[PDB]
Structure formats: C-alpha cells, structure tokens
C-alpha cells in the first residue's frame, strides 16, 4: 500500500510539474532522465523513505506510465507470454504454454489504457479513437496489434497483441501432421523455390491460407515480393515484400480499391512475385497476366474441391471479366500461366491434407491435360473414426517444370524425392 | 426455465448441453418474438469459463456469465452518414482478436459470410441467431445473405461453405397460443447436388389443441444414434451423456 | 550520431520558427536562401559547433526536406540507380547493375514519405491520398512513378520510381532482338505506309510506346502527322509533325485539356494522321471517327494482352464515353474504322515480342471476326530460361487491307512478304 | 364506401380483411389517382388496437384510428442541400423504434429494400403502397428501386428477398371511365429460377359497358381454397372467415 500511495503521489506531482508537450519535443532517453531527476527531487522533497533499488523501480515505473506502455511493459518484455489480451483497464490475459492465464496486472482506467493504445499503435504511424475506433497493425518486430475503442466495446478499450511466433507456420508442421509425406514437402519446396506458378485451390475449411504461407516461406529473401489481400493474414519472413489490402466500398458504395485494381498496380511495381490471398473475381484474369507478363513465381488461394475443378472456376472468373475472350483462349492463357495446382482438403475426420500436387500439362484441342504428381490415397479409417490414407507418387519422374528446376539447380533434389515417395 | 415451460425437454435440455459444451457450430434461427436471442443467451451458459469468447450485437442484449468476454456493438451512422461500423466490420475484426469462440447477436446482411469464415478458420463453436421460420429457410437467408456481400461467389460455393461452417441449427418457434418451442435440432449432414441435406435430431410435433385451446405437442428424437457432430462430442467427453439423452428422448 | 541529432534538433527548431506555407509561396532560390539563413541562425542561437561542410549538408538537407524530395534527393541524382523502391519510410530498395539492393537511406516517418510522394505527384499535377490511394504518373523526365497510399499500403505509404532511359529502339533493333521476324517488319513496314488505321495493344511494359514510334518511322515526310501524348514520349523523325500534349486539372479542378478535346481539335486542324499516345478513355470514339472520316492512318496505343481484349476495351471505352448508343453501333464502328491491332506482349522470361498482327475482318451478328496474318508461337524454352518461339505467318494472302496496299504500289511487298515466312 | 361504390366484393372486403389483420406484408400498388393511399388507409383499421404501428409519410395523409401509432413525415433537403432525412432514414429508425407494422406512406426510392427487410425480419404486417399498374410491374418496380438503392445485389438476389418478403399485392386502378376498382388481389407464390411466379387470388373482369358509358365487370375469386398465407390466417384463427370468404365469391 505505502508503494502504491507513494508511486501515486509521485505521479500526480511530476504530471503538475512538467508538461508532457515538453517531454514529447525530447528523446524517449532524454525525457527518461528528465523525469528521473525530477522523480527523485520530488521524493526528497516529500521525505518518502525509499531503497535506491526501490527507488529506481519506482522511477522506472513511473517513466513506464508516462513514456512507455504502462503495466504491459513487463509483459511484452516477457518471452514465455505470447499472447496479450487486454479486455478493458481492470481484466488482462496472457496466452502462456499455449493456454490463456488471468493476470493481476491492472490498468489505472481506460483513459489511460486507451493512451497506451494510441501510443503503441502510433508507434507505426496508425491512430485509433472515436472517429475511427477500430485499428489493426503490424509492429515492426512482426507482433501484431488490434485495438477496438470504447464506443464499440462495451466494456472499455480491448487490446490484443500477438507476438510472432515464428516456427508455427512451417513446412515441418505440415509434414508431423502428416498433412504431406516428406517427399511431398520436399517436393513442394523445390516447387516453391523453382519459382513456379502456384494455384493453391482447397475446399471449405482446408486452411489452403496456411499453406500459401508456407509455400511463400520458401520465396527467396531477395525477391520483391507483392502480397495483395482482402483482409491481410499473411506473414512473409522476406524482407522485401510489400503488403497490400482491398479497401471495401464505403456505405455509398464508392472509394472501393478491389483486388483487381490491387493487382492491375501490382503489376506496374516490378514485383518479382505476386501473392494474391484469393482468387474470386476478375483479379484472376489480371493474376493470371502476371503469372505470364514474367512475374513467374506467383501464388494464389482459389475456392475448389479439385484441380479440375479449380481450373473450371479460373475460366468462370475470367468469363465473367466481361472480356470477349473465347473459352479456347482462357483455357490457353490458363495453360500458359499456371504451371502447379496443389489442391488441400479437409477430409471427413476434419483433418487437413494436401490432397493432389498436379501440373498443366498443356491443352488438347478443348480439354487441358493435368497430371498429378502427388495424390492422396484413402485406404480406410480408424476404429475411431480417424481416415487412414498415404500419400502417393505418380511416378511421373520428369513433371513439365523440371527445366525450372534443372535451372535452379534443384533437380536432383526433385527427383530423389519424387523416387523415395514412390 | 425452459425446461419448466416445456420449451424443451430434459432430455432435450441436455443435447443442447452437449451441442453447446463441445463447441459446436451453431445457427439458432426463429420466427418473430420465437426467442431467439433468449435461447442464444441459455446455450452461451455452457460455453467454457476459459474460452475467450467475443459478442457482436446491434443492441446488447446478450449477459454471458464467463469471465472471458469481449462485448463489441455496432455503431449506426449518424445523420451526416459518417462513422457507420457495420456488424461485418465487427466480425472482421473478431477473426483477429484472437477469440475462441465468435457470438453474433443476429446475422441480417453479410456479416454471415464473416461469421461463417470464423466457424471454417478454428473458431469452433461460433454462434448467431437468424430469423427464419425454419432450418431449410435459414440456410436459404444464410445463402442470400452472403451473396449481399459482393463477392463473386457461385451458388454451390457458398452452399459448400454453409455445410463445411455451420454444423447444428436450433429452430425456436412461437406457437398459435402464444407458447415458445424449440421445434428443430437438426445438423447440416452435407450437401447432395445443389441441395444441402439436414437431418433433424430432434423435432416437436403437435398432435392437435386442447379444448382449453393450447397447443398440444411432445419433443422427440427423430433416433439419430450417430449425430455428424459425435466426433466432437467425443473429443470432449461427453458423448456419452449424447447418447443417453438421445436414447431417452426416443 | 551527433550530425543526426544535430540535424533532427535544427529541424524542429526551423519548424518552431516558420510556417512551411509561407516559404513554399516564395520560389525554390528565395525559400531554400531564407531556410539557409534560418538555419544558419539557429545553429549560432544553439551553440552548435560544427565544420562548414557539415553546416552546408545540414543545411541543405534542411532545404530539400522542406522543399525538395528529401532522402530520395542523392539516390535520384545518382545515374547508375535504375529503379527506386521504398516500401514504407524505413525500407528504401535500389536497383543497381540489374540487382536489387537494400540502402541504408531511410525517412522521418510514413507522413512524411507521403508528403514526399504528394509532391512528386504533384509535380505533374497528380494527386494522392487517402480518397484516391492509387497514383501512376510519368515525370517530365521520362520516369515513371507508382504511389500507393497507406489506407492499401498497409506498411506505410508506397513508392516505385523507374527512371527514364536515354535510348529508344528502331524496327532494325526489333529484328535484332527477335522481337519480330524480317518478313513481320516488311509487313509492318507495308501497313503503317499505306496508311492503314492501326492500334498497337499490349501488356505493361510490352513495349507499344517503341512499337509505336517504329511504326511512326514509316510515315511520308509530307503528311501533317498530328501527335497527342502525355508526357511527350514519342520522337517522330518527320518534318511536318505537330506534338500536343493533354494538361491535367489543377488542384482547383479547372484548365483540364483531356485528349479528347485534343483529338476534337485535331480533327479541324487539317492533320493527315492523328497519332494518340494512349487511348484510355472517351478519346477512343473521337479517334474511331476520325479514323473512319477522312483521316486515315491515325495510331493509337492501347492496353490489352490480346487483340480480343482490345476490341472489347474500345468498345467498353466507347460506352461509357457519355454518349449512348447500342453495342452493336460501336461494334460496327470498330469495325469500319480499326483496319489492324499490333499486339506487343512480355514473356514469361521478360522479353518483349510482337505476338499478333491482326486484321479486323468484319462483324458476324454480334461478335467481331478478325484474322490473324502474323502469330508467335512459342515452342519450348532454351537451356537458360529464355522462351523459344517463332513468328509464322497464317497464309493468308489478301489481307483485308490488301487495297491499301494496292493504292500505294505497296501490294507486291505484301505478297512477298506474306509469301516469305510462313 | 367501397364496398358500396363496387370497388370490391363483399367476399373481396372480407378477404382484405383478413389480410389485414393477419400481418400479411402488403403491398398496394397502383396507378396515379387510383386509390392506392385511400385504400391503404382503410386497410389499417385492421390492425389491432394493441400493434405499435409507425406510418411514415412524405405528406401526412393516412389517419389511422388505432391508439397506438406513430406518425413520422420526412424532411425534405434545404435550399442549401442539408437536413434531408429521406424515406430510408425513417425507416431504418424504425428498426429500432421497437414498432409491430410499420407503414410507408409510399415505397419510391431505396427505403423499398429496407422496408422488405423489416417484412423479413419480425415486423410482419408492414403495409408499403407502390405506384404501379399491374402486380407483375410492382414487383418489377419494387426490384429496380431495391437494385438502384445503392447496395449491389444480384438481380436473383433481390428477387428471392422480394418473394420471402412480400405476401400480397393489391392493384387499385381507375378504369377507362374514370372509376375506381381493386382489380388484383394477388399472392406472390414463389421464385422459379428467375421469374416471380404469382397467384391471383380475386381478380376484376370487365364486362361490357352501361348506357351512360360506365364500364362494367365483376370481382371474382380464382378458387384458390389455401393460399400461401393461409398458415397466418390459422395463426389468428381468421382460417375459417378466409376460407369462407373463398368460396363464397367464386
Ligand atoms: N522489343 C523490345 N526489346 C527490348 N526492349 C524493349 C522492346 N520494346 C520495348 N523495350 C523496352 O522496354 C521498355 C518498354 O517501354 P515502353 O514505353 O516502350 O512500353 P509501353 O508499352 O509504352 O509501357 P507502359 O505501360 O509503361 O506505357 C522500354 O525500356 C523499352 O526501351
Ligand atoms: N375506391 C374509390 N372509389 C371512389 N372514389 C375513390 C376511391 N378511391 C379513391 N377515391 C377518391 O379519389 C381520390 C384519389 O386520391 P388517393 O389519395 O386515394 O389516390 P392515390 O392512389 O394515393 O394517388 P396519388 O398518385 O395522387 O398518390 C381519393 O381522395 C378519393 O377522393
Ligand atoms: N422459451 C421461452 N419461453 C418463454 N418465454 C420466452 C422464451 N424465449 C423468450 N421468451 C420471452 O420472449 C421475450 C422476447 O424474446 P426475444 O429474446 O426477443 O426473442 P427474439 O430475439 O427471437 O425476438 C423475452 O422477454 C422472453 O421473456
Ligand atoms: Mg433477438
Ligand atoms: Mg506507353
Ligand atoms: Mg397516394
């Protein structure tokens, strides 16, 4: 009690006497020392008895609530929490060992959580308030910061920030979770690294945004590469990419940014890849001109349940472009684009696999020919309902991008796996 | 209380439990003043303490009792037609909070779509009421809602995505006599040609009125053993006390 | 770090001291010697001791962020650089020999990389914010500027300058570079001659600005060939060439001279040829009139990746050029005056060809029916990654043209020519 | 009156009747001077005493009886463009006014989309007049003011939101000798593919002509016995006068 009466008192005294204007025209270690001095002249002048280890927590404490982040500071300096999630000024939680901790922390009240809101969002040049409540940023660490104002939440100010977790996203996931065999995963990091075009197709509920991450994890780090999303989720370890977002049209129906527009300006930035989170309109056609304009490399999600099928919506999407394009040239252009289909599915158990990794092979007359060169086998279930399936190679040992790999230098990885998958 | 005023039976009171404990996808539709938005707030009282649960409403209505909540209302636009906050944008934003389970106080635009996404994407367990006067017509609202939201998406794009979101739909109607029912639990089993296919685990039938002019009826397990959602149960523990129930409702 | 942190405190103590608006109504020399002199005042009112030298970068990097383009300032004076990418305030990328590099050069912050960018846009009366996000434009000195805002950009403001290259290609270099076989330049020679109504169609980048100038280069030195651009890119050799260029509105939103008053005037200036840069917008109807009353062999570039796509981009441009009239009277419109589409496209490689020359045969109930007279068919891909292709002619030996050709004597160079490669 | 003035059947005024106390979501179309805001406002004293009902006017013409009613009117924009608060704005409100029926004094503009939202989410009852010289053309007329209403829909879409919305059409029309009739009483069966299908329940057939040039016809019922409403009608137990009122004028 005596601690918090003296930090209170101490607080409300250097608040009366130095004027955060001041502080804010000097350096975050000038200010610091500023207020340091001036919290120690302000014990001695109210004759607290202090440690000087007390003393200087107490100071640090202090230049916290009035230059840091307040009560979260320990918290973000933790390495354990991954999680924070700040539900008004009275109730915080941490996400420790993966599972979701009440804590004592407390803040003085909303005004001054909604301060630490506006200062950690400002931290990236975003503003959060009354008029625009809602905020949603990517601290340059990688961590990321939602913030819901109190005229939307009821119960104050709501504050999330998640810190990257850097090895959740990875193909050694997918290949524990037997979502790939390993020849598989190698297979599509050769794919990846090749600079292939990529259709990600899945159904509902395969979590093929998952995977376009972890294809995206095997861009090299100096590509320029150009991420176009309608709500941005993906998170790129290259240092050169460049993240973009569909501006929905306001009430009026006007201002709207879609992701054609997105892509069609893509193209004018000398990307090197362009990653479009998902293909539902006439931005395919657009993507697709990337894909053969000499963009090679690009990726994109697209909603089906077949490669077939996916090539069947990547026509629909272009025809409904309004271009007088005959179906025999979309289905050219589609050939000439696309080079990989990796087709993701979430299967009866609710598991997810990378059902087909399948290659365009070209177009015979009206149809175009695929070949799969990994497929998913289903061979039966568990006594727990649990589906039992192996992943298969085609046996095709020279798929249309082996030149890509040759290239590359990849080809012998590409067919050591492709011979041990079998 | 429900149970008291024969809404639903024990027996019934009981898989709502389960469905609502095993974080089930859920759609509670209903007709008008059927309470939809009392029944919603029931089933929330078997939501898990530590789940961080996250509500949108136009007006707050919803009281969950868990310590872990996030209460988010939309703010209309002002007579100027500015700072409108739509409920899509509510849930938008709840798919980044990091929530465990996502309650939509009532999808009436495309907010659905959103909320759909949250039940594809981990969120198990989302919640909504819907006004509609049956399952089939609230799959119906729910697929003409999402085509309210632009996107491109085909007909039988948007019915894969209602039978791989949405898993339970608790049709709550209000009777001639002014009485409250819940009249339909049934699952979205899958989706045959352009059709999703439902199959009701548990149904009220009316077999006529009481010359005092109330309607008579009883709840009944349409003896479904398997419920699509067992596995869940399962997962969970409680698949046994499914079964009991479903048994003893038979 | 003392220069820094110097230069951070003169800059704030300049902002204290005056008001940015009332330099930038003085000219460049007046603003940057009363920025000199201020700062100037200050470093001696702040006891700043430093070498001249240092005071003269201070200062003049104190003018350039007031007024010029800040950081940007040494990487544009520098010629090596060929593109200038930065992606947020604090990620500055530069192309140098072909490669990509990080530099250490970095801003203030993302407002002030957006005034930045405001400025330069700006300079050729672009505007960018929050209500039009986007902003492409090419600078006087033939660079190309792409902006996008930080609404899209979700890292911060977003910025690619292309600078201008000092050479331009010729027909001679086209054949050089494979871009066209010798048969398809006697061709085209043939086609601009005999004034022929010609639209060059392309992808970004695909090279219809050169072709187009190529094309230029066979026009009779005594036709009034009349050229409208923006930006000024074409370099016609010809004697009796007159050069107009649009001017975009001011910030008042009065003085815009678009291209289709240009083409309007143009029809009553007396011109042969009417050459239009870029056909975007109404202008296309205009240019369309003209090349069906009496001004035959006007050009006009558009951006399309097939000559389909093209024929519906003029129609679509003729739409919603105000004036209402049926689909089909457009249709036949393009008919009666596009006589050839040129389609200059990149390959999956990057290199640039001359895919299709095209003839607008006619129109069959609804839909247009054009014949191709030269394809590129592309057959494999070599050793190193380049596409291998070969332009064949289609055989037919009266193109719909062919009277042209007759008027002018050109008609036995075409049959050879068509003759030739096959 | 009107029914002394010929302008419906006895069996057509019970029938109307019925519709009206029912909570059918109606729509009065018509064409200019036909009668449309006389005959909404006769339809009106059918609602119950106890509804809270919301007109919304542009005029303030209706004089509703009921003692629980709310009377707004629009503002027109100033001379300076400011201060407008158009249709659509009070019926947003409304929404949120917690009324039973709400009446729009005429359905021109985009309000026509939210007032069918109110039809198809709990305010059942809601009474709009359109201007419109057949049903077949209100319901056309009713998709293009919901298509232009900002909000773009698929043209399907607006359709199924009209067909699950809007319960009965009745067309007032002045005839060639200058007299007034309710010639359709109409039921908006369902959506087939991409056509309304409709079904007249009583329709006006002319004739001949009188000495004194006034035309001359008769009101009679298609014989339609279980109209797609009638499940309202047993709701209230009104089944019995409706089906009377069938099958007296057939
Ligand atoms: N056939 C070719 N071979 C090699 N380089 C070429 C070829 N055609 C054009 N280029 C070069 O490629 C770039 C294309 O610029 P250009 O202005 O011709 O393109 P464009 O089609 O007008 O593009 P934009 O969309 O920018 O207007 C220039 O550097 C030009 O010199
Ligand atoms: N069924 C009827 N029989 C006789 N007279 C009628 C009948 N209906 C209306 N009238 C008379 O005709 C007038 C028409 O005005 P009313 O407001 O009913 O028309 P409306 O359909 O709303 O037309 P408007 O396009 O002007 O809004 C009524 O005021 C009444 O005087
Ligand atoms: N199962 C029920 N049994 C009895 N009364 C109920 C029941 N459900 C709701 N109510 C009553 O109905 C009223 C309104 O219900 P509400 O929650 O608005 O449903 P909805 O939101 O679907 O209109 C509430 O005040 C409540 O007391
Ligand atoms: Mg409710
Ligand atoms: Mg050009
Ligand atoms: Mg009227």
Redesign the interface.
Known sequence: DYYHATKTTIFNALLNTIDLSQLA?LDLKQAGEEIRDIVAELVAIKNVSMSVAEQEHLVQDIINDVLGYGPLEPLLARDDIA?I?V?GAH?V?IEVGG??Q?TNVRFRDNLQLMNICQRIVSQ??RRVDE?S??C?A?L?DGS?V?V?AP?????GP?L?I?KFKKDKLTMKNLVEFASISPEGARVLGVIGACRCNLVISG???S?KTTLLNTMTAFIDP?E?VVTCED??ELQLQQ???????????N???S?A?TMR??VK?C????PERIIVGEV??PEAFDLL?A????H?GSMGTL?A?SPREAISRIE??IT?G?????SK?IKEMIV?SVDVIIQAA?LR??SRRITHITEVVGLEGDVIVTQDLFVYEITGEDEH?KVVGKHRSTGIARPRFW??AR?YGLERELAEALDAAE
């Open positions: 025209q999680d999630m539900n109730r939680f599972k979701v009440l990236v040049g008029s409540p809602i949603d990517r340059p990321r939602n819901i005229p939307l939440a009821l119960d709501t999330t998640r159904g509902t509920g979590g100096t320029r709500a941005a240092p050169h990419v460049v993240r973009l977002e569909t501006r929905p049209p009430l009026e129906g201002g940014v527009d997105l300006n193209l004018r930035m000398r539902r309109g001109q894909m053969n304009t000499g090679d909603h349940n629909s999407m409904m309004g271009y007088g394009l005959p040239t000439g979430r158990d609710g309902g030149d890509r290239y």
